[PDB]
Symmetry: C2
Subunit: 241 residues, 2 copies
């Protein structure tokens, strides 16, 4: 039934599915150490993950997939989804990252963790780009849903008829979200030329969000913090429950 | 800028004309892996620099910004060329006409099959979409211009002017991509769907490049090398 939705109903579904804004652990000892900041950020990420699974299950077409394919997509996207949410939260705070309403950090505090100021700088540049483009909430939700469906679709094993069907379904849903993004842009008064230029501008930022995730993963490993990454089993458990 | 005055057909012609040749592995037929690929990629890089200088709009940038874009995009450009070459060889990667490898040969290298497998999947996707050569060159130029444009370290007026220019050129390639699709008979809906399909594969190419880099240092041209190669 997901591919029978209209553009306006897809928009409505995605806005209704949005997860809550969570708070960081209240009153930590400030200033931070590297260990304590990572501790606060890990704790917040672990709690956001549960709500991300709930959101994902309400993205039209996601639960049509096998549980295995749902986990693979989440495995592939989760850090990108957390990151774009952060960028969105931070749009109205130039020069700062709004990790939580009670955890607003500027660049110089990313220094307290080794290697994170580079990633801080990349996240701040993405928030500046979103601000420059006047990204709209309805566009953000579509972009976040694209990330979920797209990031892992190309690394499916995907060699049987069923898998061809799964990948085909994902690409049809992704076409529907493109239709939706274009509809939102037409309704706002953009010419056809402006519509296609803005769609491309938004999808190309996704490549930078990928980059940021890859570099973030690198450092969640460089700091010997691989047990911070949600396992296949954990993700599967959250999906079934 | 001359780039911003080009029609879609003039942009495609420019990019097709700039295409580099398909090089051969130096393997001697009448007579090992990583060196064959490194030697090949080294020779490909020289051609890439001269290709880049022919992408409309690229030479309007400062040399420093040209280098930054090449630094950020060179492995993704190599990869998309590989994937394009291998399109008509399902299950195989055509590194060169005399170096056609399948999974089994990817496993032998401690240079992983993980990346081999991701490249094959990109080739399958291109095949499945009937990717056209005119679309390919557009995509290769979008990688060059886009991959580095969010990581310029400067905030001078010039840096703002440079970023704006890159996005205007990128807008011209979008237009070009859409025109090609309209000329081919796609509906307005099919045009924007296919454009999105193409651009979202670029997120996977970025992923493969990042996994390839982390394998490469598990050889990469430095800023100074690229700069030297540029002013020539
Ligand atoms: O890649 S890193 O910068 C990464 C990015 C940012 O800081 C690190 C991080 C993070 C993620 C998971 C974790 O267990 C700890 C930290 C972030 C994060 C982003 C959004 C969000 O809602 C919560 C946390 N290390
Ligand atoms: O970085 S990797 O992905 C990379 C990708 C592919 O193989 C590695 C590689 C390569 C690049 C530069 C170099 O000095 C050596 C090797 C490739 C390549 C791609 C296109 C091209 O036109 C020329 C070379 N890698 C490690 C790697 C190594 C071995 C194998 Cl089998 C696959 C990937």
């Amino acid at each position: 039934l997901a591919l029978s939705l209209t553009a306006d109903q897809m928009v409505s579904a995605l806005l209704d599915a949005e997860p809550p804004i969570l708070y960081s652990e209240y009153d930590p000892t400030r200033p931070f150490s590297e260990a304590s900041m990572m501790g606060l950020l890990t704790n917040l990420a672990d709690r956001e993950l549960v709500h991300m699974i709930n959101w994902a299950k309400r993205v039209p077409g996601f639960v049509d997939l096998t549980s295995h394919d749902q986990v693979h997509l989440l495995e592939c996207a989760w850090l990108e989804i957390l990151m774009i949410g952060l960028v969105w939260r931070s749009m109205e705070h130039p020069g700062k990252l709004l990790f939580a309403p009670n955890l607003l950090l500027d660049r110089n505090q990313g220094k307290c963790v080794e290697g994170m100021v580079e990633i801080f700088d990349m996240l701040l540049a993405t928030s500046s780009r979103f601000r420059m483009m006047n990204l709209q909430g309805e566009e953000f939700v579509c972009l976040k849903s694209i990330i979920l469906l797209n990031s892992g679709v190309y690394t499916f094993l995907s060699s049987t008829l069923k898998s061809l069907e799964e990948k085909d379904h994902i690409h049809r849903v992704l076409d529907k979200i493109t239709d939706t993004l274009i509809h939102l842009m037409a309704k706002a008064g953009l010419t056809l030329q402006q519509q296609h230029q803005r769609l491309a501008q938004l999808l190309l930022i996704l490549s930078h969000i990928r980059h940021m995730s890859n570099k973030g993963m690198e450092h969640l490993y460089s700091m010997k913090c691989k047990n911070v990454v949600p396992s296949y089993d954990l993700l599967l458990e959250m999906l079934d429950a």
